[PDB]
Design a protein around this ligand. Sequence first.
Ligand SMILES: OC[C@H]1CNC[C@@H](O[C@H]2O[C@H](CO)[C@@H](O)[C@H](O)[C@H]2O)[C@@H]1O
Length: 345
Amino acid sequence: TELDYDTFCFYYDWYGSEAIDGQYRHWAHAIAPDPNGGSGQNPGTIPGTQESIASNFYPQLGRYSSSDPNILTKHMDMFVMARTGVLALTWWNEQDETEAKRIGLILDAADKKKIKVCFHLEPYPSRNVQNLRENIVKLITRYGNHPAFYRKDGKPLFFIYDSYLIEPSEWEKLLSPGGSITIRNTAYDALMIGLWTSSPTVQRPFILNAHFDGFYTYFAATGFTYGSTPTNWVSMQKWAKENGKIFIPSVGPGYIDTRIRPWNGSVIRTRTDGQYYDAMYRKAIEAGVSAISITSFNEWHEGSQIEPAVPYTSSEFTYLDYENREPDYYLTRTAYWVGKFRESK
Ligand SMILES: OC[C@H]1CNC[C@@H](O[C@H]2O[C@H](CO)[C@@H](O)[C@H](O)[C@H]2O)[C@@H]1O
């Protein structure tokens, strides 16, 4: 029954409904142009109707709003079922008071089930080390005293998505102890977990020169990057341990995003009734890591979700579903692997 506080599940708060938000945000979504496609593509959009949503799967909870109190209660109950102690919240620097309100709603709901919340800092517009520092300060100031705000050994933790978009010479200003705008040894110090993507020849000096406290791999699709190739995890962990870094590999139950990225079929990983998830989670446990991240709770666009899904067919699309498993199988199977992780941690 114990929640695991070193298990981080990537959570997305960007869904809307007509009733609450005035539109089906994110269930409606632009279709992405082919990066190798022509010059003047008109890929179109997915309208977020009942029949047609921007996922290859279909949520048991329907086209829900992330601000709906009833949905938040259910999501937190699902985290309890999964034994996942930390919700890693996507964060886009929206700046509007309604972002703040929603963050406040998630924190309050989480705390009722003793779930903790940390922030997943996304590549928001014009993100750089100066406004990153500004934002880290604001988040710690605004939410640091909330009982659900995550700390590891007294420290906040931030995952930094696509951290490679900012060079190490920039990162060092923020993350070196001698950095010109350093957070080290200040009230705003935190564990900063950057994204390990490619080969060790590039990633090792990146992580060292950028002064990240750790790294994660994010991608649910095996082999999409060097970092998301689980046979690499034992050597990645040995390097991390040698260099005083926290390795948080990311595990997922599958991947498919061809509703929003029709050209991206090569990245599909079928779930094969839970077999894919089992193989991946087992690999993370075997690498002897001290923490695990799960991609994802509810990234519906990318079909990596462990949130319950239902069989559904419409005139628009035949949705995938969990096959010979119940809608809540990925939640309970996550609990199973969390228990195994705890036993040998
Ligand atoms: O949370 C990290 C990462 C996970 N995958 C999606 C990334 O966002 C991008 O893709 C989604 C659709 O899956 C779009 O809605 C976003 O606008 C796009 O930036 C996200 O950064």
